[PDB]
């Protein structure tokens, strides 16, 4: 049975969060779109294997909408790490495995480097380290233009599975609709430069498990592969593209469970 609730942190944010299971703590950090309903199936599946799974909407997004402007504008890996620790403190989670994709990837590596007493191990997926122009330019269109565009980029270009992506239901898609403009203004310019991967020796020997989607164009995360190899971090693939927890939940859950037992 799943806890669905909110909890407030002193930095101004009222997080919407969900929790299921008992055992060691596993925390699933959303990608830039901030919507934790993307993990629904997995939350249960990873729970059933002996974990306490927690997740949440990111600040400014979906049901964690109530937050001060600094939390969803000029967003950096460091800012977001800072916010995730605060919801972990509030929910009294002392040690966690953490998973994260895209800006969630950036945050989890930053949690790992910045709070090693707190992080049992970190899974990072498709960490963005380059400024992408086509997405940057959308931050000056009308909110409703942005949503139509980004909804479409998600659906056809990076979802890694359009059936699955679309099967998330109308409510999810209604919340994403609101998130797209917020994301577009706050994330694309400031997340990539903040990537905590430039210092190779900080990475070395840390419990970190890096993946990229098997069907993503090689161009997209080529740098991820080079960085992980140079720093001896394990690097592999998941089926799909930018959202393996949406396109391939069963394999995603198995992977999280399996990597967690490894460091357990």
């Amino acid at each position: 049975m799943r806890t669905r609730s909110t909890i407030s942190t002193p930095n101004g944010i009222t997080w919407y969060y969900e929790q299921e299971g008992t055992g060691p703590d596993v925390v699933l950090v959303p990608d830039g779109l901030g919507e934790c309903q993307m993990f629904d199936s997995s939350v249960s599946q990873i729970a059933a294997q002996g974990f306490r799974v927690t997740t949440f909407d990111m600040p400014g997004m979906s049901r964690s909408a109530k937050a001060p402007p600094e939390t969803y504008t000029e967003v950096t890996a460091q800012k977001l790490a800072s916010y995730v620790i605060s919801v972990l403190d509030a929910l009294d989670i002392k040690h966690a495995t953490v998973w994260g994709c895209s800006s969630g990837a950036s945050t989890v590596v930053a949690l790992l480097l910045g709070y090693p007493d707190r992080i049992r191990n970190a899974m990072c997926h498709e960490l963005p380290t380059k400024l992408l122009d086509h997405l940057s330019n959308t931050a000056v269109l009308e909110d409703e233009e942005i949503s139509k565009i980004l909804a479409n980029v998600m659906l056809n270009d990076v979802s890694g599975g359009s059936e699955a992506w679309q099967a998330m239901g109308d409510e999810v898609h209604a919340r994403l609709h609101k998130n797209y403009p917020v994301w577009a203004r706050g994330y694309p310019r400031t997340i990539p430069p903040s990537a905590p991967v430039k210092d190779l020796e900080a990475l070395r020997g840390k419990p970190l498990d890096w993946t990229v989607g098997a069907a993503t164009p090689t161009e997209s995360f080529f740098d991820n592969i080079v960085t992980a190899t140079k720093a001896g971090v394990n690097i592999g693939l998941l089926p799909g593209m930018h959202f393996p927890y949406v396109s391939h939940p069963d394999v995603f859950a198995k992977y999280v469970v399996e990597t967690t037992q490894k460091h357990l």
Copy 2:
């Protein structure tokens, strides 16, 4: 003026070849399909920067079909290297820059490792090191079966440009139509296990430049990127997928040219 002629080697192969320009020798080795008309506009383009460019259909393929079965069955990288060195000998090319994709990439790395006095530098693209069941399984089918399947794969899966692919002409595809069965019986099972890249240390410090196609699914050549990075080999991208010299002639020609110039 392009020479378009035939030359014979004492290993029983009568090679169809083409040569253009004047200058330090650059040799463009085809991929498994063994069809050098794929290089046509780039031959011109490269030669026009001060190079003799030589290319050739591969043994058993296209207009090089007059060869003994050993040259096109149980094919391995070391064997193709041997054949190439022999046509080089016939053409009195003592020192060459070499490009090769796919089985052509294994070949050029094998040329570089095995004959360092002959190879000035080597460019390799999308080097196969993993078996691919579904291409492998085609070998048992009837000739016409194989051609329909593989031609379709070339066109829609890995060309990186279906328009450019089809624009090769009816002649090219008629010769490719014949090569498919030959390639399926001869190459997929034996080429990957002969990949000359299991010895990372032997690649360290070599004049070798490795690329993967920007648009290729990440899973296809992830291992190239890992290997190149572990061995300190320059790795990077070219636009397209498996056939940059068909889909992006201009970038291909310039890349060959810059990289060769780097080694004069």
